[PDB]
Each structure stands twice: as structure tokens, then as C-alpha cells.
């Protein structure tokens, strides 16, 4: 009940997911995914994870640029579909919006279980920690621990990346 900023961001996150889940041509799908990526960056920034939000935003911006190129190359049609240009896309979009609103109403009005367990709301500020400690940041130190603690993770990840380069070359080789 305090400026609802986190709630508004999460709602826009769901709206963007509904937007690109209706599958209204991959150009607009990428627009929706970019909006959701930025909004999620904000969501996790509001919890103290600034590096992670910026990183996911950067990664998804690059990925959506590549997806835009691929959509122009091999996923296009004479009349690309937008959210209002087709009955199925519009119906899915409106159904997703209405179901999100019904969920939000059912949660705010009553503390009733939907899928996993009954929720409370009350503003996500309540569950914070009152942590007064540090001349560093916990998120940055935890992520930097990947090179001192996570040797095994670095090994498996680097191997997977090299194998991925080899794999894409082999797949697209052709013949």
C-alpha cells in the first residue's frame, strides 16, 4: 500500500509476458520481451540486486537484437500480425489480461489460495531484513565468489560454451 511501485512493475511484467505469449509476429514479441526484461531489471533493482538486473537487461537486449535479425530473415510474412489484426491473437491477449486482473482481484480482496498456497500481499516491503552491516554489497561478493568457490561451475560452464560453438557449427554445416 506504499506507492505500489513493486506491484505496478510486476503487473507490467505480466502484461509484457501476455503480449509476447499471444505470438503477434516475432517483431512485436521481441518488443514485449524487451519491455518485460527492463521491467524485471527494475523489479530486482528494487530488492538490492542491481548487478543482476543490469546483466539480465543487457543479455536480453543482445538476444532480442539477434532475434529481430532472424525474424527479418526467416520469420516474416506479407502482413505481419499485431495484437488487434487477428481474432486469435486478440482473444489470447484479452484473456491473459482478464485472467491476470481476476487473479489480482482475488488476491487483494481475499487471502485465498490460487495454485500453490494462500498469499497475503500487505506490500512486499514487510518481508525485508533490517540489515545494517557492510562496507561491501552482498550480491557483488556472492557473484564474485564464482572464481574462488565455484571452480566446478566455471569448468562446466566454459566447457558447455565451447561445446555450444562447436555444436552450432555442426548443426548449420548443412550438406
Amino acid at each position: 500500500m506504499t506507492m505500489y511501485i513493486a506491484f505496478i512493475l510486476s503487473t507490467i511484467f505480466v502484461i509484457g509476458f501476455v503480449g509476447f505469449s499471444s505470438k503477434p509476429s516475432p517483431i512485436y514479441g521481441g518488443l514485449g520481451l524487451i519491455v518485460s526484461g527492463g521491467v524485471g531489471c527494475g523489479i530486482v533493482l528494487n530488492f538490492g540486486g542491481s548487478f543482476l538486473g543490469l546483466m539480465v537487461f543487457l543479455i536480453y537486449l543482445g538476444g532480442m537484437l539477434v532475434v529481430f535479425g532472424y525474424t527479418t530473415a526467416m520469420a516474416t510474412e506479407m502482413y505481419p500480425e499485431v495484437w488487434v489484426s487477428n481474432k486469435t491473437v486478440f482473444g489470447a491477449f484479452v484473456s491473459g489480461l482478464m485472467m491476470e486482473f481476476c487473479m489480482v482481484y482475488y488476491a487483494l480482496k481475499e487471502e485465498e489460495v490460487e495454485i500453490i498456497f494462500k498469499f497475503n500481499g500487505l506490500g512486499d516491503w514487510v518481508i525485508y531484513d533490517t540489515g545494517d552491516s557492510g562496507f561491501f554489497s552482498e550480491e557483488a561478493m556472492g557473484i564474485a565468489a564464482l572464481y574462488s568457490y565455484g571452480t566446478w561451475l566455471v569448468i562446466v560452464t566454459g566447457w558447455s560454451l565451447l561445446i555450444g560453438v562447436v555444436v552450432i557449427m555442426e548443426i548449420t554445416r548443412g550438406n
Binding site: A6, F7, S10, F13, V14, F17, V18, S21, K23, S25, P26, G29, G30, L33, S36, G40, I43, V44, F47, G49, L52, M55, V56, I59, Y60, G63, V66, V67, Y70, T71, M74, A75, A92, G96, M103, A107, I116, F117, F119, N120, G121, L122, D124, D129, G131, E138, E139, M141, G142, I143, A145, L146, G150, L153, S160, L161, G164, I171, T172, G174
Partner: protein, 98 residues
């Protein structure tokens, strides 16, 4: 469970439903897969930030890495599909019916 958690789980459910329904394009399904990755990343980050699991902070990053791999894989496959048919329509992938 806070309301933001509920919104993130709803986003994941929406992306999964969007993937399990195919319209025509394979690129749209790949986009739904990437959305599922994004929702999983946000969920993991929120859980790890709320409960101050310090060593778990690298976990979302690794997640993102393999996300790219999947994306890369899908994109590679899509190229081949296009090279066989000129379109990325999933209806052309019906040879193994018989």
C-alpha cells in the same frame, strides 16, 4: 507469499501456456522459451535476495548462460528448417507422421 512472487509465477505459467500452444511460427515459440528463462531468472533472484543466500548469487548468472545455449540451439535448428521449406511454419514438420 508476497504478491510479487505470485505475479512472477503467473508470468511463468503464461509463458509455459504460450509455448505449449503453437500458432505458425517457430520463432514465437523460441520467444516463449526465452520468456520462461526470464521469469525463472527473476524468481530465483528474488528468492536469493530475500533470504540472504550469499553463495547462491552466482546461480542466476549460470542460469542465464545455459539460457543462451538453448536459444542458440533453437536458432540453429530454425535456420535448417527454413532452408528446407522457406518458412519456419511448424505445419511443415509433419514428415514423421508416417
Amino acid at each position: 507469499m508476497p504478491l510479487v512472487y505470485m505475479n512472477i509465477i503467473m508470468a511463468f505459467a503464461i509463458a509455459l501456456a504460450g509455448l505449449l500452444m503453437y500458432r505458425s511460427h517457430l520463432m514465437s515459440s523460441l520467444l516463449c522459451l526465452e520468456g520462461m528463462m526470464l521469469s525463472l531468472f527473476i524468481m530465483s533472484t528474488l528468492i536469493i535476495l530475500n533470504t540472504h543466500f550469499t553463495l547462491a548469487n552466482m546461480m542466476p548468472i549460470i542460469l542465464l548462460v545455459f539460457a543462451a545455449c538453448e536459444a542458440a540451439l533453437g536458432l540453429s535448428l530454425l535456420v535448417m528448417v527454413s532452408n528446407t521449406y522457406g518458412t519456419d511454419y511448424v505445419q511443415n514438420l509433419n514428415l514423421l507422421q508416417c
